[PDB]
Design goal:
Layout: E1 4-6, E2 10-19, E3 22-32, E4 38-48, H1 56-67, E5 77-82, E6 88-92, H2 99-105, H3 112-131, E7 144-148, E8 159-162, H4 174-179, H5 186-190, H6 197-212, H7 224-232, H8 246-252, H9 263-272
Helix pairs in contact: 3-6, 3-9, 6-8
The structure holds ligand T7I.
PDB class: transferase
Keywords: Janus kinase, pseudokinase, JAK2, transferase
Assembly: monomeric
Length: 274
């Protein structure tokens, strides 16, 4: 059950973007924190569109299922806004935002060791989810947020967290799922009820391709009909020019779901590139 946050204690500021049927804002939460000290806390606010109240249950279930587990690489959910008739999730504000846009912005200052560390963190999170038999269902670089940049002064790697999947592919319109090829796997285009832990191993491979491609979007040049043809003809993504993770990517994007490797195996591969 979500903690209730008063709207009096939440200020909505700038729009950061949109998700599927949602708008996203930075804001400030006034809260009593540790030792009773009043704090002004940055928050990430996710507002379900008023025209899409039909999806409210899935919208909230997405955050609720992640919030029932605790992990260093999973975004913290703060609760929900007691916000009139609106449907609003309140979550941790991650300083440097989405990995996909960060990759693009800093394609100069990002080398393969940086990409490898982020891939290892993502695999660590998915391993945790796998052990908990918890399906995410929307792993993508947009949904990976950068807490802290590489700090050469201190040697510390970048650190990331994974945000919740949003409204599930099991209820979204077919055309949205097709637009999400190649993150949505072939068997889920066949039938979205095929959502499985193996879904996430496929989507991990797509996200790794995004990590290795400087924030390019795979298959962006293909319209939905052509994206379906990509799966019909059983193609694979092209090797990223930074090709060190090409094999791992194709191994995860296996058209047979049962053959996709465990995240234990995936972490082993990542750690053996050394
Ligand atoms: O915490 C944050 C922090 C920021 C953010 C955005 C811009 C600059 C610095 C941080 N940006 C997001 C997003 C986001 C926003 C627009 C499009 C996709 C993602 C998410 C979300 F949870 F929604 F994944 N959290 N987040």
């Amino acid at each position: 059950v979500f903690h209730k946050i008063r709207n009096e204690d939440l200020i909505f500021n700038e729009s950061l973007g949109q998700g599927t049927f949602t708008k996203i804002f930075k804001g400030v939460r006034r809260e009593v924190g540790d030792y009773g000290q009043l704090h002004e806390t940055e928050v990430l606010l996710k507002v379900l569109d008023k025209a899409h109240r039909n999806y409210s249950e899935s919208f909230f279930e997405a955050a609720s299922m992640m919030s029932k587990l605790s992990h260093k690489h999973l975004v913290l959910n703060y609760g929900v806004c007691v916000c009139g008739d609106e449907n609003i999730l309140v979550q941790e504000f991650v300083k440097f935002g989405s990995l996909d846009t960060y990759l693009k912005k800093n394609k100069n200052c990002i080398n393969i060791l940086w990409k490898l560390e982020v891939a290892k963190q993502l695999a660590a999170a998915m391993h945790f989810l796998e052990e908990n038999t918890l399906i995410h269902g929307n792993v993508c670089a947009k949904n990976i947020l950068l807490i802290s940049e590489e700090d050469r002064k201190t040697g510390n790697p970048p650190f990331i967290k994974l945000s919740d999947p949003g409204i599930s592919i099991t209820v979204l319109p077919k055309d949205i799922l097709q637009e999400r090829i190649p993150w949505v796997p072939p068997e889920c285009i066949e039938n979205p009820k095929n959502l499985n832990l193996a879904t996430d191993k496929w989507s991990f491979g797509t996200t790794l391709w995004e990590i290795c491609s400087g924030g390019d979007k795979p298959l962006s040049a293909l319209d939905s009909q052509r994206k379906l043809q990509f799966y019909e003809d059983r193609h694979q993504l092209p090797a990223p020019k930074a090709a060190e993770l090409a094999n791992l990517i194709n191994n995860c994007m296996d058209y047979e779901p049962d053959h996709r490797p465990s995240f234990r195996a995936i972490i082993r591969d990542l750690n053996s590139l050394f």
